[PDB]
Amino acid sequence: FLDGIDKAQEEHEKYHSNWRAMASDFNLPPVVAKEIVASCDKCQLKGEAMHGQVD
Amino acid sequence: FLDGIDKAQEEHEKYHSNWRAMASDFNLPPVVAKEIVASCDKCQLKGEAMHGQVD
Ligand SMILES: [Zn+2]
Ligand SMILES: [Zn+2]
Numbered sequence: 001f002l003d004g005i006d007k008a009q010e011e012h013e014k015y016h017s018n019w020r021a022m023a024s025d026f027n028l029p030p031v032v033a034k035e036i037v038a039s040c041d042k043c044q045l046k047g048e049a050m051h052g053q054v055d
Numbered sequence: 056f057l058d059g060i061d062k063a064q065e066e067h068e069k070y071h072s073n074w075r076a077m078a079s080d081f082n083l084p085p086v087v088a089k090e091i092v093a094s095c096d097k098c099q100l101k102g103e104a105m106h107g108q109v110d
Contacts, residue, residue, distance in 0.1 A: 001084045001086045001087075002084055002086060005086065029056045029057055031056045031057060031060065031087060031090050032086060032090075034090045034093050034094070035086050035089045035090045035093065037093065038090065038092065038093035039089070049104055049105075050102070050103075050104075050105075050106060051106045054109075
């Protein structure tokens with residue numbers, strides 16, 4: 001569980017975009033791969049949340 | 056993994072807000088509990104994403 005995530009966790013590269021590849025590389029069910037996406041803010045949120053303010 | 060999520064998965068009640076309680080109830084590491092939060096859109100996104108449009 002946590003140990004698999006530590007080795008799987010790395011820089012936000014192309015592997016982060018395709019979480020399915022990581023699950024196959026470690027042969028783990030999408031459950032562990034999805035958690036990494038949830039922890040990585042870049043992989044979780046796509047566009048910006050609020051528009052901020054109008055200048 | 057997936058089987059634990061099916062039993063853990065339910066309606067968005069108070070348990071969904073406190074994911075730590077669910078992990079203790081099933082004695083599973085925050086990894087499985089976090090995945091449920093990532094899958095449940097209500098638990099994942101807090102406020103609204105884009106402001107939509109200005110009327
Ligand atoms: Zn990432
Ligand atoms: Zn929920």
